[PDB]
Structures are given as C-alpha cells and as structure tokens.
C-alpha cells in the first residue's frame, strides 16, 4: 500500500476502521455517526503520513493543521484530540528527532526505569519528551540490553539482535531514517551440508523441506480441527504433535505395504488353486487318453457300441483339452498380474536416516526462532503472533546493531553498574534500592512516583530472586511468570583474516549427526563487512554448550567448516567470542516463547501495571505505581526488538496518561 492508506499500515493500523484503543480515547466518535468515523480516520492517517513522510524533526500540532486540507481542517479541536492521541501513544514523534517546541523548563513527576534496555530506553525518551523526570538504572556497564555489539579492530558482530525482520509496517524503519544505519538485505538462499561435508542435493533438499512444512500444517490441523491439546491431562507441546504426526505417517507407510503384499498372497492363492485344477485335469486327460488308445485297438469293422466308445472318449478328451487351455489362458493373466504387483511396490519407508537428519535441521530452525526445544512450545499458541509479521527482506546492521541503543540513549539519565535489589511500591510512592555492581556494599536509594521495569523475563523468573518486590507481586502476576517461557539461544563468532566461503552467500546450514545435536552449530552467517563467520546453537544444544570452553566450541565449530571447505583452506581465527545468555545474570536467557500451557494472553498480563494497597486503612484506591515493559510484555510482537521498543512506548503512553492527565478524551 501507498498513500494515506500506506501510512496506516506502516503504523500497524487499519486505515478503514477504528482500533480498540482509538475507541477508548474517542468513544463519542466510534459510537457516533458513520461519516464522523470517516473524518477522524482521515485525520489520523493523514497525520501519520506527515510524520512518517519526514520523521527527522518533531511534528507540531500547528504544522499538522497547517497542511490539513478542507473540509478536514475545520474542526481544530478534533485535530488536537487526534494529534495528541498519536504523539501520546508514540505513533508520531518517537525516536531521535530535533525538537521544535523546546523541553519544558521544569519537569513534573519522577520515574525510575529499571534497565537501560531497548524497551526501557524507548520509554525514557518519550517520558523525557513528555516533560517528565526520567532516570534509568542499568546493571551492566553498557547501554543496550540484549542488543550486544562485539567490536574489536574492524571486526564487528552482534551477539544479540542481528536481523530486522522486514520494514513493512516496522517502527525500526523510522529509526534508520533518524539514526545512521547500514541496513543491508539478507539473501534468503541457504545451502545445506551433512556430517560428511558434502553439499545436499536439490533432489533431497526440496523433498525434505516441503515435507517439513506439510508436517507443520498437520499439527495445525490437529490443534484446531481435532482439538488435540490435552493428553494424560497435560498440555500438548509442538514437538509432541510433530511426533504423533510423524508416527501416523510411519504407521501409514506400513499399512500401505501390508495391504499390498496381502494383495499378492490373494493372487498367489488364486494361482495355487488354479494349478491344482490343472494338475488334476491333466491326470484326467492322461487317463482318458489311455482309454481312447485302448478302445481304438478294437479294429474296424466293429459294432456300434464300441464305435461309440471311441467317438465318446474322443469327444470327452477334446472336452478336457479345451478346459485345460482356458486354464492356461487364466494362468496367463495371473502370472502377469503377479509381476505387476512386484514391479509396482509402494514407498519402501517413511524416512531415511539421511532424510530425518535433514528434517532435524528444519526443527533446529524452529528451535532457533523460538529459542527453545519444541517439547516446550505450545501446540495451539506457539505461532499465535504470525498475523503481524512485517513485509520485505530481512536486513542486517553491518555497523553493529548496538549503534541504535547508543543513539537512543543520548541525553538521558542513566546510572550504569547499578543493580536493582528491591523495588518498594507504596500508596504514596516508590523507593528503589540499588547496589553498585563493582563494590556491592555501596547502597543507593532512589525515590519516585512510578517505576517502569524492563527487567528481562529471565531475571524475573530467577529463583532465588535477583529483585525482591516489596510488597509481593500478586498471584495472578507471578503465575503469569511461571507459565510463560524464557528460552535460550547462543552465538559463536569466528574472526578470520580472509574469506574462505562463498561471499555472495549470506548463510548456509549444517546437518547434525543425531537428533539430540540438531541445533549444535546448525547454521552459519556471513553478514559483516570484514571476514567474519557467525554460528548458531539452538535447541537443547545451546543450553548444554554453555558449560564447554570457547576452545572446545571453536574447535568443533572449526571442524564442520573444514569438512565443508577443506582442511587447507580454513586458518585458525584471530579473535573468537562465545555467548552464554542463560548464564548472563542480566538476561537469564535469550528471548521468550509461548510455553506449552501458556497463551498469548499471558503476554498481556505482563503489561497490566500494579496499583498498591491503601496505606492508611479505608483510604481511597490509589494510583497504579509499578509499570512493566519489555519484549516479554507485548503479545502481538514478542521476542523481538521492534516489539520490545513498542512496549516501552506503550508504557510511556500509559504512564503519562496516569500522571499528566488524559487531556484528549473529552
């Protein structure tokens, strides 16, 4: 889409309908008159179009209404009501934009943000743009959270976010126009290479992959058609569905052979019956032939009784010679029909260990996208976020993804090396207790109105807790943390001094020897400008490889390469890096997934902020004081960076409305 309806899509919004959020802000309009709704939708899309048309600088309400066209530019109050709803929930004027109306002399309200993460940074700029006092507590000595950028010499690699999943309707596209970003497309071509180091053949590559997707649709059918989501009372994992789909195909291969060789024995036994008549008929022919020869011995002239006995036996012997030929016509058809069934046998087996190996590489590919083994992924809801996928190529940041958070964090209040130990949220305010990571005696006390908490789901999931919430987070919230999934994904980086790979291929596979190693270094990537290779460890493999030294990993890593490129070709790498995210105390994993028994609806529970109890008993229900943002909190875009970013714009809206007034809902 292009035009005004393009801007509505680039902003993740139906051009021809009001969203459920527009309804709570504009309920006099949504429930009003069908023409009314149309006028408003045009004002919305038209504004989005202006900001997206050149988002380097702020969109004043004056500039909007300037450019608004009659009859739309008549109701100035509606335009304000709309330019506010946008700027407020950060559908416009988010990011790094030169500000027209300079920041207010004196800010109102104090907000501590736990974590200089991408979600956290996103909130910081909006609240600071809104006119508030924002201060960020980060446990690391570097700004980005899971956006990590290793940099040495000219070597550059991201051990965190690496690819932008499509600019169609993506907030990150706007940042690139604002930020300096070398976005280069990834070419989807991916070869495969088995344990031998010999490339896979187009025959099998395609035979396997299509059967993979077909197996996916099979599970999807089980999930929504046969309501297969319980068994011995537990929830059904995606992996469990897969093996019941595979086990019903290995069942059908066997049923299909059995009712084929059971056809042969039906025709073997029609022949065994047939010969038995032929042999018995021959004996009757052999004896009538005798009798004929014996009564031909009586010489002419003979009386008529013996003349009949030669005529008779001759007609009887011609009668059984005529049967025996119609039973050698019939042995003709069956002896033929039985080379038929032997020359057209069915499929020998469902899958060759060569097939199931290349199939286990398509399951490593899933376990990469979800950063978990498929035993854990929920059968019905693992892909629940498929509908909001963006459009276009996937891209990479060749100058390092960390350039974004560093750009995002310019001019904010950030306290590095500040480990939050305890969040106290009370009816009158919040006090955040933080140690200095270097000297963990050294204590920090921070007081504020509301606390925005971009702690990664792992850190929350940690037992014993890295952070203690005073008071306890309530049971609906804690149970939403057990049910969800935080999974694990790791990267090995290999920095050589010259390219020894196909440079115009951005990525290639590696098929693993058993199932249990299916994610062990299953995929490589060539994206950085310098000669750098980068290799994934998905599935059960990635968690288990945290306990092995770099050298052992890199050794293994180096081997697979030699088998694909030859021992002479691969030199020892100059510098090497191994991530261990389940091991990092400021992650406790990689990103999140919809665990079996969880839903996309536990992602919504993570956003719902907490309003503390009355301090004085009998006092009026207070404000909600504790806010949550992060990739784990945003149902429609989880596990990503764009998604985490959006969530921190979400809470910048929700916070400002709660503490600076809903001035657009009149």
């Amino acid at each position: 889409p292009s035009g005004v309806e393009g801007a509505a899509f680039q902003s993740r919004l139906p051009h021809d309908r009001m969203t459920s959020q527009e309804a709570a802000c504009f309920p006099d309009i949504i429930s009003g008159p069908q023409q009314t709704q149309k006028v408003f939708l045009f004002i919305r899309n038209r504004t989005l179009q202006l900001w997206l048309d050149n988002p380097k600088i702020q969109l004043t309400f004056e500039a909007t209404l300037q450019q608004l066209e009659a009859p739309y530019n008549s109701d100035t109050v509606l335009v304000h009501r709309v330019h506010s709803y946008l700027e407020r929930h950060g559908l416009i004027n988010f990011g790094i934009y030169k500000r027209i109306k300079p920041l207010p002399t004196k800010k109102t309200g104090k907000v501590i943000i736990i974590g200089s993460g991408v979600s956290g940074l996103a909130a910081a700029r909006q609240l600071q743009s809104f006119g508030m006092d924002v201060t960020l507590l980060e446990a690391r000595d570097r700004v980005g959270g899971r956006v990590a950028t290793f940099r040495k010499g000219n070597y550059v690699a991201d051990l965190g976010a690496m690819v932008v999943t499509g600019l169609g309707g993506n907030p990150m596209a706007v940042v690139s126009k604002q930020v300096n970003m070398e976005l280069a497309k990834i070419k989807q071509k991916c070869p495969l290479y088995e344990a031998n180091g010999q490339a896979v053949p187009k025959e099998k590559d395609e035979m396997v992959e299509q059967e993979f997707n077909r197996l996916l649709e099979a599970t999807s059918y089980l999930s929504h058609q046969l309501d297969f989501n319980v068994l011995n009372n537990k929830p059904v994992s995606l992996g469990q569905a897969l093996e019941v789909v595979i086990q019903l195909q290995e069942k059908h291969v066997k049923d299909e052979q059995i009712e084929h060789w059971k056809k042969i024995v039906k025709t073997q036994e029609e022949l065994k019956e047939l010969l038995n008549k032929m042999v018995n008929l021959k004996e009757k022919i052999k004896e009538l032939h005798q009798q004929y020869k014996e009564a031909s011995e009586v010489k002419p002239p003979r009386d008529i009784t013996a003349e009949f006995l030669v005529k008779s036996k001759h007609r009887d012997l011609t009668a059984l010679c005529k049967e025996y030929d119609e039973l050698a016509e019939t042995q003709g058809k069956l002896e033929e029909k039985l080379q038929e069934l032997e020359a057209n046998p069915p499929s020998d087996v469902y899958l060759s260990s060569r097939d199931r190996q290349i199939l286990d590489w398509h399951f490593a590919n899933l376990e990469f996208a979800n950063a978990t083994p498929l035993s854990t992924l929920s059968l019905k809801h693992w892909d629940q976020d498929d509908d909001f996928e963006f459009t276009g190529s996937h891209l990479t940041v060749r100058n390092g993804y960390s350039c974004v958070p560093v750009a995002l964090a310019e001019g904010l209040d950030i306290k590095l090396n500040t480990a939050v130990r305890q969040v106290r949220y009370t009816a009158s305010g919040c006090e955040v207790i933080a140690v200095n990571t270097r000297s963990t005696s050294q204590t920090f006390i921070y007081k504020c109105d509301a606390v925005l908490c971009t702690l990664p789901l792992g850190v929350l999931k940690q037992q014993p807790p890295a952070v203690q919430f005073v008071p306890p987070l309530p049971e609906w919230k804690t149970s939403a943390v057990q049910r969800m999934g935080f999974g694990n994904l790791n990267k090995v980086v290999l920095c050589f001094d010259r390219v020894f790979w196909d440079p115009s291929v951005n990525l290639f596979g590696h098929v693993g020897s058993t199932t249990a190693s299916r994610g062990e270094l299953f995929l490589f990537w060539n994206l950085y400008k310098a000669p750098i290779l980068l290799a994934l460890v998905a599935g059960e493999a990635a968690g288990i490889m945290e306990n092995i030294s770099d050298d052992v990993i890199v050794g293994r890593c180096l081997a697979i390469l030699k088998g694909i490129f030859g021992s002479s070709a691969v030199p020892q790498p100059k510098e090497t890096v191994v991530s261990r995210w389940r091991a990092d105390p400021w992650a406790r994993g990689s990103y999140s997934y919809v665990a079996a028994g969880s839903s996309g609806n536990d992602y919504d529970l993570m956003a719902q902020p907490i309003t503390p109890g009355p301090s004085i008993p009998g006092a009026p229900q207070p404000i909600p004081r504790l806010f949550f943002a992060g990739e784990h909190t945003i149902r429609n875009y989880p596990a990503t960076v764009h998604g985490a970013l959006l969530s921190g714009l979400r809470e910048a809206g929700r916070i400002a409305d709660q503490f600076l007034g809903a001035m657009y809902t009149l």
């Binding site: 649709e217 599970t219 498929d386 509908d387 996928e389 963006f390």
Partner: peptide, 16 residues
C-alpha cells in the same frame, strides 16, 4: 517466534 526465521522460513500454519 515464527516471525524470527530469516532463512528457510516455515509455511505450515501461516495465512497464505
């Protein structure tokens, strides 16, 4: 999740 796959994106269970 499924959106993340950049190479050999899976098809089954999508809305194509």
């Amino acid at each position: 999740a499924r959106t993340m796959q950049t190479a050999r994106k899976s098809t089954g269970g999508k809305a194509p």
